mmCIF file of C-alpha atoms in Angstrom:
data_model
loop_
_atom_site.group_PDB
_atom_site.id
_atom_site.type_symbol
_atom_site.label_atom_id
_atom_site.label_comp_id
_atom_site.label_asym_id
_atom_site.label_seq_id
_atom_site.Cartn_x
_atom_site.Cartn_y
_atom_site.Cartn_z
ATOM 1 C CA UNK A 1 11.347 13.717 -25.887
ATOM 2 C CA UNK A 2 9.469 14.172 -22.582
ATOM 3 C CA UNK A 3 7.007 16.340 -20.774
ATOM 4 C CA UNK A 4 4.623 16.410 -17.869
ATOM 5 C CA UNK A 5 0.901 16.714 -17.518
ATOM 6 C CA UNK A 6 -2.040 16.576 -15.179
ATOM 7 C CA UNK A 7 -1.747 18.157 -11.637
ATOM 8 C CA UNK A 8 -2.995 17.596 -8.152
ATOM 9 C CA UNK A 9 -4.497 19.718 -5.483
ATOM 10 C CA UNK A 10 -7.639 20.458 -3.456
ATOM 11 C CA UNK A 11 -9.062 18.802 -0.422
ATOM 12 C CA UNK A 12 -11.521 16.097 0.500
ATOM 13 C CA UNK A 13 -11.869 12.524 1.651
ATOM 14 C CA UNK A 14 -11.988 13.626 5.259
ATOM 15 C CA UNK A 15 -12.174 10.008 6.252
ATOM 16 C CA UNK A 16 -11.706 6.879 4.275
ATOM 17 C CA UNK A 17 -13.685 3.613 4.711
ATOM 18 C CA UNK A 18 -12.299 1.201 7.220
ATOM 19 C CA UNK A 19 -13.383 -2.287 8.308
ATOM 20 C CA UNK A 20 -11.323 -4.805 10.231
ATOM 21 C CA UNK A 21 -8.510 -7.094 8.863
ATOM 22 C CA UNK A 22 -4.793 -7.622 8.985
ATOM 23 C CA UNK A 23 -2.061 -8.181 6.409
ATOM 24 C CA UNK A 24 -2.861 -4.666 5.230
ATOM 25 C CA UNK A 25 -0.243 -2.256 4.080
ATOM 26 C CA UNK A 26 -0.676 1.393 2.982
ATOM 27 C CA UNK A 27 1.283 2.606 -0.010
ATOM 28 C CA UNK A 28 1.865 6.307 -0.392
ATOM 29 C CA UNK A 29 3.916 8.705 -2.509
ATOM 30 C CA UNK A 30 2.550 7.070 -5.649
ATOM 31 C CA UNK A 31 2.430 8.552 -9.149
ATOM 32 C CA UNK A 32 -0.624 10.077 -10.695
ATOM 33 C CA UNK A 33 -0.537 7.633 -13.559
ATOM 34 C CA UNK A 34 -0.343 4.612 -11.230
ATOM 35 C CA UNK A 35 -2.557 1.473 -11.494
ATOM 36 C CA UNK A 36 -3.727 -1.095 -8.982
ATOM 37 C CA UNK A 37 -2.229 -3.704 -11.227
ATOM 38 C CA UNK A 38 1.261 -2.316 -11.395
ATOM 39 C CA UNK A 39 1.093 -2.206 -7.569
ATOM 40 C CA UNK A 40 -0.203 -5.742 -7.714
ATOM 41 C CA UNK A 41 2.499 -7.258 -9.979
ATOM 42 C CA UNK A 42 4.816 -5.206 -7.721
ATOM 43 C CA UNK A 43 3.995 -6.612 -4.361
ATOM 44 C CA UNK A 44 3.005 -9.745 -6.157
ATOM 45 C CA UNK A 45 6.665 -10.653 -6.410
ATOM 46 C CA UNK A 46 6.435 -11.068 -2.612
ATOM 47 C CA UNK A 47 3.830 -13.741 -2.910
ATOM 48 C CA UNK A 48 0.217 -12.879 -3.820
ATOM 49 C CA UNK A 49 -2.416 -10.222 -3.080
ATOM 50 C CA UNK A 50 -5.876 -10.727 -1.732
ATOM 51 C CA UNK A 51 -7.321 -7.315 -2.679
ATOM 52 C CA UNK A 52 -6.089 -3.800 -3.353
ATOM 53 C CA UNK A 53 -7.976 -0.703 -2.471
ATOM 54 C CA UNK A 54 -6.877 2.600 -4.171
ATOM 55 C CA UNK A 55 -8.654 5.771 -3.346
ATOM 56 C CA UNK A 56 -7.073 8.292 -5.729
ATOM 57 C CA UNK A 57 -8.879 11.607 -5.131
ATOM 58 C CA UNK A 58 -8.392 15.195 -3.873
ATOM 59 C CA UNK A 59 -6.208 15.081 -0.774
ATOM 60 C CA UNK A 60 -2.490 14.839 -1.493
ATOM 61 C CA UNK A 61 -1.038 12.095 -3.576
ATOM 62 C CA UNK A 62 -2.760 8.808 -4.510
ATOM 63 C CA UNK A 63 -2.958 6.181 -1.833
ATOM 64 C CA UNK A 64 -4.032 2.592 -1.774
ATOM 65 C CA UNK A 65 -3.991 -0.474 0.566
ATOM 66 C CA UNK A 66 -2.602 -3.829 -0.310
ATOM 67 C CA UNK A 67 -4.022 -6.901 1.489
ATOM 68 C CA UNK A 68 -1.619 -9.777 1.501
ATOM 69 C CA UNK A 69 -2.482 -13.426 2.165
ATOM 70 C CA UNK A 70 0.048 -13.807 4.941
ATOM 71 C CA UNK A 71 1.335 -11.255 7.489
ATOM 72 C CA UNK A 72 4.915 -12.609 7.520
ATOM 73 C CA UNK A 73 4.923 -11.660 3.833
ATOM 74 C CA UNK A 74 2.934 -8.434 4.090
ATOM 75 C CA UNK A 75 5.764 -7.407 6.303
ATOM 76 C CA UNK A 76 8.450 -8.749 4.192
ATOM 77 C CA UNK A 77 7.031 -6.624 1.346
ATOM 78 C CA UNK A 78 6.679 -3.304 3.305
ATOM 79 C CA UNK A 79 10.030 -4.305 4.847
ATOM 80 C CA UNK A 80 11.435 -3.589 1.410
ATOM 81 C CA UNK A 81 8.878 -1.889 -0.900
ATOM 82 C CA UNK A 82 9.074 0.729 1.884
ATOM 83 C CA UNK A 83 11.388 3.170 0.114
ATOM 84 C CA UNK A 84 11.129 1.813 -3.463
ATOM 85 C CA UNK A 85 11.548 3.991 -6.503
ATOM 86 C CA UNK A 86 9.001 3.500 -9.300
ATOM 87 C CA UNK A 87 8.886 5.526 -12.469
ATOM 88 C CA UNK A 88 11.533 7.632 -10.799
ATOM 89 C CA UNK A 89 9.026 8.485 -8.017
ATOM 90 C CA UNK A 90 9.761 7.429 -4.519
ATOM 91 C CA UNK A 91 7.134 5.196 -2.678
ATOM 92 C CA UNK A 92 6.312 5.162 1.042
ATOM 93 C CA UNK A 93 5.107 1.851 2.237
ATOM 94 C CA UNK A 94 3.914 1.752 5.798
ATOM 95 C CA UNK A 95 1.280 0.023 7.983
ATOM 96 C CA UNK A 96 -1.903 1.927 8.881
ATOM 97 C CA UNK A 97 -2.310 3.276 12.463
ATOM 98 C CA UNK A 98 -4.055 1.046 14.922
ATOM 99 C CA UNK A 99 -2.210 0.925 18.168
ATOM 100 C CA UNK A 100 -0.575 -1.621 20.421
ATOM 101 C CA UNK A 101 -1.827 -5.037 21.289
ATOM 102 C CA UNK A 102 0.346 -8.210 20.696
ATOM 103 C CA UNK A 103 -0.154 -11.083 23.075
ATOM 104 C CA UNK A 104 0.966 -14.732 22.919
ATOM 105 C CA UNK A 105 1.619 -17.854 24.924
ATOM 106 C CA UNK A 106 4.618 -20.118 25.665
ATOM 107 C CA UNK A 107 3.122 -23.306 24.256
ATOM 108 C CA UNK A 108 0.858 -24.892 26.707
ATOM 109 C CA UNK A 109 0.884 -28.707 26.101
#
């Protein structure tokens, strides 16, 4: 036995709340019956999570951001989770827009 329920459509959330931080990854193409926990125990396998922000509202599919403790991991996660299949539904993990800007030094004794 099986069946579907609940739909999705409309328009809103012109702009979401943003702050300033790193180790943040955006997860898209999520199911309607998704939970911040499932996503937690999901990316949790790649270490731990600091905080998860899920919007879930008129404006396409449900989206949320996962804040990892470390970047090296935050990437290792998206590096994989990006293209994962959950509940039969495909997920789209990718970093939020920001731009360029990556400097560094040689060492400097």
